[PDB]
Coordinates of C-alpha atoms and ligand atoms in Angstrom, one line a residue:
Chain A
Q1 CA 0.0 0.0 0.0
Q2 CA 3.0 2.3 -0.9
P3 CA 2.1 5.5 -2.8
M4 CA 5.4 6.3 -4.4
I5 CA 6.6 9.3 -2.4
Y6 CA 8.6 12.1 -4.1
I7 CA 10.5 15.1 -2.6
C8 CA 9.9 18.4 -4.0
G9 CA 12.6 20.6 -5.4
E10 CA 12.0 24.0 -4.0
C11 CA 9.9 22.8 -1.1
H12 CA 11.6 19.7 0.3
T13 CA 8.2 18.2 1.3
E14 CA 7.3 14.6 0.6
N15 CA 4.4 14.3 -1.8
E16 CA 2.4 11.3 -2.7
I17 CA 2.1 10.7 -6.4
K18 CA 0.2 7.8 -7.8
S19 CA 0.0 7.1 -11.4
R20 CA -2.0 9.4 -13.7
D21 CA -1.2 12.3 -11.6
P22 CA 0.4 15.7 -12.4
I23 CA 3.8 16.0 -11.0
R24 CA 3.3 19.1 -8.8
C25 CA 4.1 19.8 -5.2
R26 CA 1.2 19.7 -2.8
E27 CA 2.4 23.2 -1.9
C28 CA 4.0 26.1 -3.5
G29 CA 3.7 24.5 -6.9
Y30 CA 6.8 23.0 -8.3
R31 CA 7.2 20.9 -11.4
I32 CA 10.6 19.4 -10.6
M33 CA 10.8 16.8 -8.0
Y34 CA 13.0 14.0 -7.0
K35 CA 12.8 10.5 -5.6
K36 CA 13.7 9.1 -2.2
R37 CA 16.5 6.8 -1.4
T38 CA 16.0 3.1 -1.7
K39 CA 15.0 0.8 1.1
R40 CA 17.3 -2.0 0.0
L41 CA 20.6 -3.0 1.7
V42 CA 23.4 -0.5 1.0
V43 CA 26.7 -2.1 2.1
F44 CA 30.1 -0.8 1.1
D45 CA 33.6 -1.9 1.6
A46 CA 35.5 0.9 3.2
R47 CA 38.0 0.4 0.5
Chain B
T1 CA -0.5 4.4 6.1
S2 CA -4.0 5.3 7.4
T3 CA -3.9 6.1 11.1
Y4 CA -0.4 5.7 12.6
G5 CA -1.2 7.0 16.1
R6 CA 0.3 4.4 18.5
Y7 CA -2.5 7.3 23.0
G8 CA -1.5 9.7 20.2
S9 CA 0.2 13.0 20.3
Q10 CA -1.2 14.6 23.5
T11 CA -4.7 15.6 22.4
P12 CA -5.5 19.1 23.6
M13 CA -8.7 19.7 25.5
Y14 CA -11.4 22.3 24.9
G15 CA -11.9 23.2 28.5
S16 CA -8.1 23.6 28.9
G17 CA -7.9 26.9 27.0
Chain C
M1 CA 37.0 18.7 -1.5
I2 CA 37.5 17.8 2.1
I3 CA 40.9 17.3 3.7
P4 CA 42.2 13.8 3.0
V5 CA 42.4 11.6 6.0
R6 CA 46.0 10.5 5.4
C7 CA 48.9 11.8 3.4
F8 CA 48.9 10.0 0.2
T9 CA 52.7 9.2 0.2
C10 CA 53.4 8.6 3.8
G11 CA 50.5 7.3 5.7
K12 CA 50.3 10.0 8.3
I13 CA 47.0 11.3 9.6
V14 CA 46.5 14.8 8.3
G15 CA 42.7 14.8 8.7
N16 CA 42.7 16.4 12.1
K17 CA 44.9 19.3 11.1
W18 CA 42.9 21.4 8.7
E19 CA 41.0 23.3 11.4
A20 CA 44.1 23.6 13.6
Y21 CA 46.1 24.9 10.7
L22 CA 43.5 27.4 9.6
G23 CA 43.3 28.6 13.2
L24 CA 47.0 29.1 13.4
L25 CA 47.1 31.1 10.2
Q26 CA 44.3 33.2 11.6
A27 CA 46.4 33.8 14.6
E28 CA 49.5 35.1 13.1
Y29 CA 51.8 32.3 12.3
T30 CA 53.4 32.3 8.9
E31 CA 52.4 29.4 6.7
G32 CA 55.7 27.5 7.1
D33 CA 55.7 28.0 10.8
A34 CA 52.2 26.7 11.1
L35 CA 53.0 23.5 9.4
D36 CA 55.7 22.4 11.8
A37 CA 53.9 23.7 14.8
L38 CA 51.4 21.0 13.8
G39 CA 54.1 18.5 13.5
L40 CA 54.4 17.9 9.8
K41 CA 58.0 17.5 8.8
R42 CA 58.2 15.5 5.6
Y43 CA 57.5 17.6 2.6
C44 CA 55.2 14.8 1.5
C45 CA 52.9 15.5 4.4
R46 CA 53.3 19.3 4.1
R47 CA 51.8 19.5 0.7
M48 CA 48.7 18.0 1.8
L49 CA 47.9 21.0 3.9
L50 CA 49.3 23.6 1.8
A51 CA 47.9 22.5 -1.5
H52 CA 44.5 21.5 -0.1
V53 CA 41.6 23.6 -1.4
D54 CA 38.4 23.3 0.6
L55 CA 35.4 23.0 -1.6
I56 CA 33.0 21.5 0.8
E57 CA 32.6 24.9 2.2
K58 CA 31.2 26.0 -1.2
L59 CA 29.1 22.9 -1.6
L60 CA 27.5 23.5 1.8
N61 CA 26.1 26.7 0.4
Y62 CA 23.5 24.9 -1.7
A63 CA 21.2 24.0 1.1
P64 CA 18.8 21.2 0.4
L65 CA 16.3 22.6 3.1
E66 CA 16.6 26.0 4.9
Chain D
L1 CA -22.8 -0.9 19.8
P2 CA -19.8 1.5 20.2
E3 CA -17.8 -0.7 17.9
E4 CA -19.7 -0.2 14.7
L5 CA -19.8 3.5 15.7
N6 CA -16.0 3.6 15.5
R7 CA -15.9 2.8 11.8
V8 CA -17.4 6.3 11.1
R9 CA -15.4 7.7 14.1
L10 CA -13.2 10.3 12.6
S11 CA -9.7 10.2 14.1
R12 CA -7.2 13.0 14.2
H13 CA -4.8 11.6 11.5
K14 CA -7.5 11.6 8.8
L15 CA -8.6 15.3 9.0
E16 CA -5.1 16.4 8.0
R17 CA -5.3 14.8 4.6
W18 CA -8.6 16.5 3.9
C19 CA -8.0 20.0 5.2
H20 CA -8.3 21.3 1.5
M21 CA -10.1 18.5 -0.3
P22 CA -13.5 19.8 -1.4
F23 CA -16.8 17.9 -1.1
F24 CA -15.9 18.3 2.6
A25 CA -19.4 19.1 3.7
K26 CA -20.6 16.0 2.0
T27 CA -18.3 13.2 3.5
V28 CA -17.8 14.3 7.1
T29 CA -21.4 15.4 7.7
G30 CA -22.9 12.3 9.3
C31 CA -20.0 10.8 11.1
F32 CA -19.1 11.1 14.7
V33 CA -15.9 12.4 16.2
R34 CA -14.4 12.1 19.6
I35 CA -14.0 15.7 20.6
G36 CA -12.5 16.8 23.9
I37 CA -14.1 18.8 26.7
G38 CA -11.9 18.2 29.7
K39 CA -10.8 16.0 33.0
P40 CA -10.5 12.8 30.7
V41 CA -14.2 12.9 30.1
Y42 CA -15.4 13.0 26.4
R43 CA -18.7 13.4 24.6
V44 CA -19.8 12.1 21.2
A45 CA -20.7 15.3 19.2
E46 CA -22.4 15.4 15.8
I47 CA -20.6 16.7 12.8
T48 CA -23.3 19.1 11.6
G49 CA -21.8 21.8 9.4
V50 CA -18.4 23.1 8.2
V51 CA -17.5 26.4 9.9
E52 CA -14.4 28.4 9.9
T53 CA -12.6 30.2 12.8
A54 CA -10.7 33.4 12.7
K55 CA -8.0 31.5 14.7
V56 CA -5.4 29.8 12.6
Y57 CA -3.8 27.1 14.6
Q58 CA -1.1 24.6 13.6
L59 CA -1.8 20.9 14.0
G60 CA 1.7 19.3 14.0
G61 CA 3.1 20.3 10.7
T62 CA -0.2 21.4 9.1
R63 CA -2.3 24.5 10.2
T64 CA -6.0 25.0 9.9
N65 CA -8.2 27.8 11.1
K66 CA -11.5 26.1 10.3
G67 CA -14.2 25.1 12.8
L68 CA -16.7 22.2 13.2
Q69 CA -20.3 22.6 14.0
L70 CA -20.6 19.9 16.6
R71 CA -23.4 19.2 19.0
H72 CA -24.0 16.7 21.8
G73 CA -27.7 16.3 21.6
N74 CA -28.6 19.8 22.5
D75 CA -25.4 21.5 23.7
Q76 CA -24.0 22.8 20.4
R77 CA -21.1 25.2 19.9
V78 CA -18.1 25.9 17.7
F79 CA -15.1 23.5 17.6
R80 CA -11.6 23.5 16.3
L81 CA -9.7 20.5 14.8
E82 CA -7.1 20.1 17.5
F83 CA -9.3 18.9 20.4
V84 CA -10.5 15.7 18.6
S85 CA -9.3 12.5 20.1
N86 CA -7.8 9.5 18.3
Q87 CA -9.5 7.4 21.0
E88 CA -12.3 5.1 19.8
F89 CA -15.8 5.2 21.1
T90 CA -15.8 3.8 24.6
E91 CA -18.8 2.2 26.3
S92 CA -19.5 5.0 28.9
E93 CA -19.2 7.6 26.2
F94 CA -21.4 5.6 23.8
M95 CA -24.1 5.2 26.4
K96 CA -23.6 8.9 27.3
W97 CA -24.2 9.9 23.7
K98 CA -27.2 7.5 23.5
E99 CA -28.7 9.2 26.6
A100 CA -28.0 12.6 25.2
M101 CA -29.8 11.6 22.0
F102 CA -32.7 9.9 23.8
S103 CA -32.8 12.9 26.0
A104 CA -32.9 15.4 23.1
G105 CA -35.5 13.7 20.9
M106 CA -33.1 13.0 18.1
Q107 CA -33.5 9.7 16.4
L108 CA -30.6 7.4 16.5
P109 CA -29.3 7.0 13.0
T110 CA -30.0 3.6 11.7
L111 CA -27.1 1.2 11.3
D112 CA -27.7 0.9 7.6
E113 CA -27.0 4.6 7.4
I114 CA -23.7 4.1 9.1
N115 CA -22.9 1.2 6.8
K116 CA -23.6 3.4 3.8
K117 CA -21.7 6.3 5.3
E118 CA -18.5 4.5 6.2
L119 CA -17.8 3.7 2.6
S120 CA -17.8 7.3 1.5
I121 CA -14.6 7.7 3.4
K122 CA -12.8 4.9 1.6
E123 CA -14.0 6.1 -1.7
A124 CA -12.9 9.6 -0.9
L125 CA -9.4 8.2 0.1
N126 CA -8.8 6.4 -3.2
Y127 CA -10.0 9.3 -5.2
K128 CA -8.0 10.2 -8.3
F129 CA -7.3 13.9 -8.3
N130 CA -7.5 14.5 -12.0
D131 CA -9.5 17.7 -11.9
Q132 CA -8.4 21.2 -10.8
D133 CA -8.1 20.4 -7.1
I134 CA -4.4 20.6 -6.9
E135 CA -4.6 24.2 -7.8
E136 CA -7.1 25.3 -5.3
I137 CA -5.2 23.1 -2.8
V138 CA -2.0 25.0 -3.2
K139 CA -3.9 28.3 -3.2
Ligands
ZN201 ZN1 3.6 22.4 -7.2
ZN202 ZN1 53.4 12.0 4.3

């Protein structure tokens, strides 16, 4: 039940975008907006 | 993600103000 | 971008000396007398701190939020 | 039963999503909220109309200056959106509301009405915002 959350550009507020939506921020109005980091396992070798 | 209260966040009263 | 942890050539830890070295230069020490007050003798280790250019101070100007 | 009554019980975490969604006077009007009076006593008031206060108050991150026309049987007054409780309908408050409704002359809303009212919320949640609601929302 995960709604594909984005982060605005100029606002830095998480929005919920499902498909068939306009990409706009729920506030201030911004057409550029980015995605959140993954939830998978990030493991590096300090190398 | 519908009501994640877990109670709550200290509900303010009406007769408290 | 940010001070390397070690001197590339030698192995010596120079990561803890960038703030101390900018503070000594702010005080009055000349730049060659600051580098040995910190304890950097080999000229391999001394170019880490002379040549370092600190870009992370400019990259921190681009705030994500506030 | 105070258990079926909790399905249409509006908690605090659900109003924040619909502070600016329209049709508001059509989904919330008919449900019951757990409003606060104050010391831990509560009364089941009736969401009657959608009013607005001249007091803008912040609810966590969000802020909302609107009011709620609530009424416990006969005692009706204005209400703000911060004093509502996430607590479900207890037994003493359910019987207290039952006695305030039997005491007022108001008919108890038939259970089929609650069953047809609780689905309005779930359809309003999965609603695709394809029309010009984003724009008025940002405004
Ligand atoms: Zn926008
Ligand atoms: Zn060295």
